[PDB]
Amino acid sequence: TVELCGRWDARDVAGGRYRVINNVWGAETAQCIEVGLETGNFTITRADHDNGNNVAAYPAIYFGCHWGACTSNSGLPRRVQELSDVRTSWTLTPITTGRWNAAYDIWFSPVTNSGNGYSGGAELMIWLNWNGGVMPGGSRVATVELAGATWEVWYADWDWNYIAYRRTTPTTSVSELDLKAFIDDAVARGYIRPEWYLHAVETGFELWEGGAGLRSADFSVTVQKL
Numbered sequence: 001t002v003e004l005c006g007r008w009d010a011r012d013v014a015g016g017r018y019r020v021i022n023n024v025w026g027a028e029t030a031q032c033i034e035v036g037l038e039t040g041n042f043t044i045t046r047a048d049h050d051n052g053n054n055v056a057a058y059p060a061i062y063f064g065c066h067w068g069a070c071t072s073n074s075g076l077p078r079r080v081q082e083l084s085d086v087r088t089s090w091t092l093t094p095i096t097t098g099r100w101n102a103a104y105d106i107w108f109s110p111v112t113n114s115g116n117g118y119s120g121g122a123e124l125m126i127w128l129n130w131n132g133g134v135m136p137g138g139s140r141v142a143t144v145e146l147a148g149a150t151w152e153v154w155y156a157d158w159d160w161n162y163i164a165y166r167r168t169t170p171t172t173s174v175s176e177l178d179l180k181a182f183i184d185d186a187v188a189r190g191y192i193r194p195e196w197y198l199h200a201v202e203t204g205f206e207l208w209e210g211g212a213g214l215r216s217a218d219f220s221v222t223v224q225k226l
């Protein structure tokens, strides 16, 4: 494995199919992750965060294009209306301390260039586990059954539409989770336009306080075009 401690450190993994990012985007507090280069599995070995109500970081693994940095042959960005299947698998190891979540972060925008972000697009999160009383942004607008489980639907109308699906009960793993079901629900709600592009599928841990001991493993994402 390799240890990453730099704020914006990254490593291509799984033959370039995915990329792992330390991503300490909202704080100066220290954080390191130990990464398996073949699998992309990583454990947060250190996290001095104590950021109050604002996220300190989001160590993650992703498929696609994150702020212009794309993985190898992901087939993304690709219009939502041109998607027929989007699947993902992940196994997370939770901890009993700190304030954090274990969640997917999926980015959409009207344009194909993601170098400057996703303004005017959407961010769809899928929260699988958490600790410390953290809550999604915005307000809960519904509770819906999708892809084999039940989810609270949280929405915030920011520079981009924020949609977070929070499982009614925590879990530590998903296998071939139907991401397209979530995208379809968000489109139905008017939060994502079919003409918009899916840029990236990411998962990891949003950290507010602490986080050492959390582990991400068995990541996979596949996308099938129509």
Ligand SMILES: OC[C@H]1O[C@@H](O[C@H]2[C@H](O)[C@@H](O)[C@H](O[C@H]3[C@H](O)[C@@H](O)[C@H](O)O[C@@H]3CO)O[C@@H]2CO)[C@H](O)[C@@H](O)[C@@H]1O
Residues within 6 Å of the ligand: 008, 023, 025, 055, 057, 058, 066, 067, 105, 123, 137, 162, 206
């Ligand atoms: O490294 C490239 C660019 O990163 C920008 O930071 C973003 C992070 O990369 C991204 O993971 C994070 O996503 C947040 C999202 O903002 C929030 O709404 C959601 O609830 O949680 C996600 C996970 O924490 O967003 C930030 C900021 O948009 C840097 O801002 C940029 O300078 C840098 O080039």
